[PDB]
Amino acid sequence: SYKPAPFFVLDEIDAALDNTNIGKVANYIKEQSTCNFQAIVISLKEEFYTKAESLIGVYPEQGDCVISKVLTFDLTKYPD
Amino acid sequence: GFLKLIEIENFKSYKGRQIIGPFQRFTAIIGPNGSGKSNLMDAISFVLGEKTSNLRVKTLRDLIHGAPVGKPAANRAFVSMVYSEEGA
Amino acid sequence: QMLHGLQRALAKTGAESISLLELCRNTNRKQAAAKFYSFLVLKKQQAIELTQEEPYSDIIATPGPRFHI
Numbered sequence: 001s002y003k004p005a006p007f008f009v010l011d012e013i014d015a016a017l018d019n020t021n022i023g024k025v026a027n028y029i030k031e032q033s034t035c036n037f038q039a040i041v042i043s044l045k046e047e048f049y050t051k052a053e054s055l056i057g058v059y060p061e062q063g064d065c066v067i068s069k070v071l072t073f074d075l076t077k078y079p080d
Numbered sequence: 081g082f083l084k085l086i087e088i089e090n091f092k093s094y095k096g097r098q099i100i101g102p103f104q105r106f107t108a109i110i111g112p113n114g115s116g117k118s119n120l121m122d123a124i125s126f127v128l129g130e131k132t133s134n135l136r137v138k139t140l141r142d143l144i145h146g147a148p149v150g151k152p153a154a155n156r157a158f159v160s161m162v163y164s165e166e167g168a
Numbered sequence: 169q170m171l172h173g174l175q176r177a178l179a180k181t182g183a184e185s186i187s188l189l190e191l192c193r194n195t196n197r198k199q200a201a202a203k204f205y206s207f208l209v210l211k212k213q214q215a216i217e218l219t220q221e222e223p224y225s226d227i228i229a230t231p232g233p234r235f236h237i
């Protein structure tokens with residue numbers, strides 16, 4: 001809020017939380033990202049990115065080593 | 081404006097050139113353990129520039145694809161971002 | 169349970185191509201996300217092959233090696 005960053009990266013900040021706090025931060029970033037900042041996260045708890053508007057899946061693949069592959073998923077065409 | 085998308089070459093389980101999707105106002109990167117996802121953030125910091133230790137890596141010749149095992153993909157890596165801002 | 173649900177889902181048509189969007193035609197957001205993660209974890213166990221080429225389309229699921237028929 002003092003010195004803005006054009007976009008954000010957030011590593012798993014929903015660490016030990018329950019559904020209430022993750023709902024708090026998700027609602028905050030939904031109301032606050034839309035006109036202040038881009039923000040991208042990594043998570044596992046489904047409600048946090050339930051509020052998301054786009055999703056980046058990655059599938060790892062076997063071989064001599066791992067090769068990861070990208071796919072994209074829309075989220076802004078769904079009810080409630 | 082914001083960051084549109086990111087391009088990577090021969091860096092942390094990313095063989096060749098693959099165009100990562102355009103970034104909306106709030107997206108997310110989800111996947112199980114060991115899926116190779118924090119490395120995207122590592123590349124973000126790398127093209128922004130930061131010391132190697134915080135990227136869980138040393139000597140910065142291990143960052144190439146295949147180097148942690150011991151056999152690098154090549155001696156050659158690109159990383160590239162595109163910033164999108166208003167005014168087209 | 170999801171593996172057997174796909175086993176009957178394949179046998180109804182037999183076109184070896186399961187649509188993600190077809191399964192979530194008449195459900196809410198939460199169960200649709202649960203189904204998406206279900207396809208994800210079934211892909212993880214190497215039981216099924218899922219194809220998606222362009223950045224935004226429906227995901228095509230076909231039986232993999234460990235499909236259990």
Ligand SMILES: Nc1ncnc2c1ncn2[C@@H]1O[C@H](COP(=O)(O)OP(=O)(O)O)[C@@H](O)[C@H]1O
Nearest residue numbers: 065092093114115116117118119144145146147
């Ligand atoms: N250049 C590389 N080539 C192949 N595998 C790698 C490479 N660098 C790291 N890995 C491995 O990939 C696995 C996935 O973890 P990592 O890529 O660090 O991201 P994340 O923590 O998101 O899973 C780890 O076991 C890591 O050691």
